[PDB]
Amino acid sequence: DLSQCDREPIHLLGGIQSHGVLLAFRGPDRLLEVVSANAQALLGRPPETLLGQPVGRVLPAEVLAQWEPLVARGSVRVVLPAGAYRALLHESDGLTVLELEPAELQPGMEETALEVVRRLVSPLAGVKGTQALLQTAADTVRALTGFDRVMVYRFDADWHGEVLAESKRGGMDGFLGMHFPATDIPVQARALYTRNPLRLIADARARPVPLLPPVVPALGRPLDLSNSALRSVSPVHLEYLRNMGVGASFSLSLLKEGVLWGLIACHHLEPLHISHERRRACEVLTQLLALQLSAEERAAEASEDAHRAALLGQLATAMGEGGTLEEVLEKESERVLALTGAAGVALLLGEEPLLVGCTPAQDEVEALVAWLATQPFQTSFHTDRLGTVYPPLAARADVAAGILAVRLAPAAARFAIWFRPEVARTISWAGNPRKPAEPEPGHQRLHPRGSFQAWEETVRDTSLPWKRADLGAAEGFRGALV
Amino acid sequence: DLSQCDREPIHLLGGIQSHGVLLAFRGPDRLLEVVSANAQALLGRPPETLLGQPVGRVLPAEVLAQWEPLVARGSVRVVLPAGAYRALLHESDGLTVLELEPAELQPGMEETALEVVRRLVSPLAGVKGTQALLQTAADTVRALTGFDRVMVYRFDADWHGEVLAESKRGGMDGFLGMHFPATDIPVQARALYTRNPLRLIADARARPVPLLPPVVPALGRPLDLSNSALRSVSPVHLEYLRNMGVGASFSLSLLKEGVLWGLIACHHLEPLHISHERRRACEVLTQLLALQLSAEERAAEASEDAHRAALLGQLATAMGEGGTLEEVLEKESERVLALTGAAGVALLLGEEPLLVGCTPAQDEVEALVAWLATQPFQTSFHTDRLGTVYPPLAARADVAAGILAVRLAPAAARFAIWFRPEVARTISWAGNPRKPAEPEPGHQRLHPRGSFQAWEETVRDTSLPWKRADLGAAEGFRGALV
Ligand SMILES: C=CC1=C(C)/C(=C/c2[nH]c(/C=C3N=C(/C=C4\NC(=O)[C@@H](C)\C4=C/C)C(C)=C\3CCC(=O)O)c(CCC(=O)O)c2C)NC1=O
Ligand SMILES: C=CC1=C(C)/C(=C/c2[nH]c(/C=C3N=C(/C=C4\NC(=O)[C@@H](C)\C4=C/C)C(C)=C\3CCC(=O)O)c(CCC(=O)O)c2C)NC1=O
């Protein structure tokens, strides 16, 4: 991939966060093969002395007492001299991996979680826009977590993102409405965050605890920490958080029909650890949000489709009525433009173009037609920045920044072309997107950018996007023109 | 017709169930106005002596201590000498109504409930049919409640219902696939269950506890118990449960888009109390099922619409390619029938009725064509039981149990008419639906039927129902033809 940013093997860094301990066992005897260097902080004896020992000799009695429920269901609460810990089991590189993390301290956590679950699963959740849906998701994640700032971050189609909603405590910086470069979350991280939907950075200023030995002996590379709850994250991201002034970070993947739609991102000014069970309660919330957004969005498309079909039905009724085609198309101009949310339409029915509403002049349309006929499309063609692909009209963003053309005949030049003007857009980036990172001389060590202050950009020469309903309506109009 | 069943005022029966206590207070001194006759077991004094007393002198300190969160939140847990009770507050008839019932005793209840909530969100529940979505909902409610039998009951358009899914104890009888008369849940019950979505019948053999006095003195009728958790239900429904052999019953209304879609109904063979907290956890599951059903239904309808529009788009290509309409329509014969899932179609392009596939004879179609013009519809007409509306073809259920017609011109009678044959359906009723009740001589006392054994009816002369995708595709074909 492109940058060095994509290259970092973030699952193979060999470090865990200092609040927990990791032990990896293999074979029928469960011999300890990999252990974190801090494992005396919970186990009494120096970790290097425990490599190669059977599990029954390294683990405390309190954990061994819970060994059967641990293996059975992969997660158990254990009470140690150092306090209550959550034990977690997964498999990686042929090893059984055991992680221990401080356990939830509030007995009423699940009751509180079930209550905020109600606030989001309730019907009527969305009855002032999906914006109120996102705001409620952010508010309830903040209530359950205690984090200073909770943001809903949506990926655009180039994988840069923007903050759509935000819940933060009074008197605190926010990022609402700002855009962030795709490189802020590089492609291997997005990959990992698609299969591992949660991640906690409990203290952005702490140093990672290394694993011992620093490679798995059979493999000659570090233990694969893809599914580790304790995995220490990229040093470059830790720098990024410090540059933002955040001491703890917790984010959750928003998966909507298989793809990474966005994130719920949380920041705290100070270190803060959330328990495993509290993180899993937060993940229920995000899966509810994904579900509410799908149902709302499909309802919106259906309503839009119904509106287009009503327009088509009225056009059909006006046909099969009086006069010629050009006459009914004259009377029904506003419906024909409304079909695709357009400001003008060129109808090429054989003679000269029929120009309805706001369109470029006849000579320019006939020229556009000559060129569309050569293009490699089948029934529909659309673009929201015509000037990039057809520079003869690149100056005419006022009437022809976007077009939608349907072919009305097989091997002949018969078309309906709808036009849209540009819509200027003011983007506010969190820092200068032209310098998304700060490499050292030589370009071997990368740093995050230093500032996230607003940096404004205006986008010109692009129309509103051609949406699914526009495309469906154009096909319906084609079928009516035969 | 408003039988005896529909007129019983089930919210004004004046009784509560024996496992709880109800008090109602009025005015700023909160004087006791109504009280259940069993209240000595909680108040220490005979209830008649407490009427007219201020709340501060009827309620133990334990309840008064929590008055403000009770008023703000509507429920609190209070620990009394008898044990832990849930206190529930609402307003009725200008009185403050207090209800007390035994509280949840399992500390881990909310943690278990959060675990079954995850089952119903998961990645994508219902990947193998909404049938498995309904099953998972019955299974999780049964797991959370411990009821012997849990059933998903859907209302049909005539408000009779059928059991679509069932989760039950081993060796238990069931009602899967069976149909029940609409009078089993009469119209005022359906109305109440739209407003109050939960109801528990903890012991179907127990007798109701009367309220004291039997009327609200200001009003001259019983206290309105619409929103009471302890309300004793209709005596004829208690007889219905006993005829079924059930000792306890619990049901949740399924509201999908504001309308009563169905019920999750639970039966226990012995008496069984479920706490308020546990009932509210079940309500989360039902609102989750409703949300899942809407998301999947909207997806299925979008997918069907997409198929119909592909069919129309192939019809458009074919017409813009060939000469004769009747030739293209002949060549494309089965796409034209697939449009509405039909077995024949009559195309009235003026001259001779063109008949494709499986249709009535030319004389017979010209007959219903003449009848169709003088009917009150603008663009489309459809029925799935043509014989009951147009007797000349009642004997032709083999080709024309259902029709769908669109008008291809305003004045004059140019139509396209799709035809469907009957589909015979075998439905099993729970008891003979001709005797849905057993009235006594004089027809003033009604009883429910005594038997629920399968009673089998085959429905004839009706097609598969015309769906919204069918109507949509026909409208699109109309636009392609005028
Ligand atoms: C409000 C907007 C907002 C945004 C847009 C935001 C970004 C964000 N980045 C990450 C993670 C990573 N970033 C990078 C690399 C680079 N980042 C750069 O700028 C350049 C210099 C670069 C490389 C050259 C890597 C390798 C990882 C994976 C770390 C790991 O998992 O090991 C995360 C998830 C972790 C978390 O929740 O804190 C988030 C949420 N956090 C916010 O709040
Ligand atoms: C497997 C399928 C299945 C069905 C289809 C089913 C029916 C059902 N009925 C009810 C309630 C009532 N029924 C009646 C009246 C009559 N019932 C008759 O038969 C005739 C004689 C009649 C009048 C002449 C009234 C007034 C009420 C309101 C009671 C109240 O709230 O006060 C309920 C809710 C309560 C609950 O979950 O147990 C259910 C779930 N219960 C099942 O499991």
Q: Which residues contact B440 (CB under 8 A, 6 or more apart)?
A: B446, B447
Q: What tokens does B185 get?
A: 């849940």
Amino acid at A357: G
With a 6 Å cutoff on the Cβ, whether B446 touches ligand 2 is yes
Q: How far apart are CA A312 and CA B357, in angstroms?
A: 28
Q: What tokens does B222 get?
A: 């019983």
Q: Which atom of ligand 1 is the closest one to the Cα of A249?
A: 38
Q: How far apart are CA B163 and CA B171, in angstroms?
A: 18
Distance from CA of A29 to the nearest CA of B (A): 33
Q: At how many degrees (to 10) do helices B130-145 and B109-121 cross?
A: 180
**Angle subtended at Cα A234 by Cα A229 and Cα A240, rounded to the nearest 5 degrees:** 115
**Angle subtended at Cα A416 by Cα A413 and Cα A418, rounded to the nearest 5 degrees:** 135
Q: How far apart are CA A185 and CA A175, in angstroms?
A: 16
- Chain B's closest residue to A414, CA to CA, is B320
End-to-end CA gap in chain A: 47
Rg (CA), chain B: 29
Using a CB-CB distance cutoff of 8 angstroms, which residues of chain B are in contact with residue A111? 110
Q: What tokens does B220 get?
A: 């001259």
The partner residues of A211 in beta bridges, in order of sequence, read A36
Resolution (A): 1.9
Q: At how many degrees (to 10) do helices B109-121 and A109-121 cross?
A: 40
Q: Which of B111, B319, B475 sits opposite A482 (nearest CB)?
A: B319
Which site among B252, B291, B303, B477 would you substitute to test the A interface, given the most A Cβ atoms closer than 10 Å to its Cβ? B291
CA-wise closest residue to A41 among A83, A70, A78 = A83
Amino acid at B478: R
Q: Which residues contact A334 (CB under 8 A, 6 or more apart)?
A: none
Phi, psi (deg, nearest 5) at residue B251: -140, 150
Q: Do A295 and B290 touch (CB under 8 A)?
A: no
Q: How far apart are CA A115 and CA A446, in angstroms?
A: 44
Q: Which chain A residues touch B if contact means CB-CB below 8 Å?
A: 107, 110-111, 113-114, 117-118, 121-123, 255, 257, 281, 284, 287-288, 291-292, 294-295, 298-299, 301-302, 305, 309, 312-313, 315-317, 319-321, 379, 408-410, 472, 475-476, 478-480, 482
Give the DSSP letter of residue B103. Answer: P
Q: How far apart are CA B482 and CA A319, in angstroms?
A: 6
Token pair 């200001």: residue:
B218
Q: How far apart are CA B226 and CA B196, in angstroms?
A: 7
Which site among A106, A253, A287, A329 would you substitute to test the B interface, given the most B Cβ atoms closer than 10 Å to its Cβ? A287
Q: What tokens does A136 get?
A: 């409620």
CA-wise closest residue to A158 among A130, A178, A187, A134 = A187
For residue A436, cis peptide bond before it (omega within 30 degrees of 0): no
CA-wise closest residue to B337 among B361, B316, B352, B315 = B315
Give the DSSP letter of residue B49. Answer: G
SS3 B205: coil
Amino acid at B428: S
For residue B228, how far is the Cα from the chain centroid?
A: 21
Give the DSSP letter of residue B5. Answer: H
Alpha-carbon distances, residue B227 vs A75, A332, B93, B192, B196 (angstroms): 42, 55, 11, 9, 6
Give the residue whose CA is nearest to atom 21 of ligand 1.
A448
The CA A241 to ligand 1 mean position distance, Å, reads 8
Q: How far apart are CA B51 and CA B38, in angstroms?
A: 14
Q: Which residues contact B162 (CB under 8 A, 6 or more apart)?
A: B153, B154, B156, B177, B178, B179, B180, B427
Alpha-carbon distances, residue A175 vs A185, A230, A427, A444 (angstroms): 16, 28, 13, 30
Amino acid at B368: L
What string of DSSP letters covers A287-346? HHHHHHHHHHHHHHHHHHHHHHHHHHHHHHHHTTSSS-HHHHHHHTHHHHHHTTT-SEEE
CA-wise closest residue to A184 among A246, A236, A260, A227 = A236
Give the residue whose CA is nearest to atom 38 of ligand 1.
A249
Q: How far apart are CA A480 and CA A316, in angstroms?
A: 7
Q: Which residues contact A6 (CB under 8 A, 6 or more apart)?
A: A186, A187, A188
Alpha-carbon distances, residue A462 vs A182, A207, A396, A459 (angstroms): 21, 47, 11, 7
Q: Which of A298, A299, A472 sits opposite B309 (nearest CB)?
A: A472
CA-wise closest residue to A69 among A61, A59, A81, A77 = A77
Distance from CA of A406 to the nearest CA of B (A): 12
Element (H, E) at A415: strand A415-420
With a 6 Å cutoff on the Cβ, whether B160 touches ligand 2 is no
Q: Do A121 and B288 touch (CB under 8 A)?
A: yes
- The CB density around residue B2, as the number of other CB atoms within 10 Å, is 9
SS3 B222: coil
Q: Using DSSP, how many helices (H) and how many strands (E) does chain A show?
A: 15, 20
What string of DSSP letters covers A232-288? ---HHHHHHHHHHT-SEEEEEEEEETTEEEEEEEEEESS--PPPHHHHHHHHHHHHH
What string of DSSP letters covers A163-228? EEEEEE-SS----TT-EE-GGGS-HHHHHHHHHS-EEEES-TTSPPEEEESSSBTTTTB----TT-
The partner residues of B251 in beta bridges, in order of sequence, read B199, B265
Sheet with A149-155: list strands edge to edge. A198-201, A248-256, A259-268, A149-155, A161-168, A179-180, A425-430, A454-459
Q: Are A120 and A136 in contact (CB under 8 A)?
A: yes
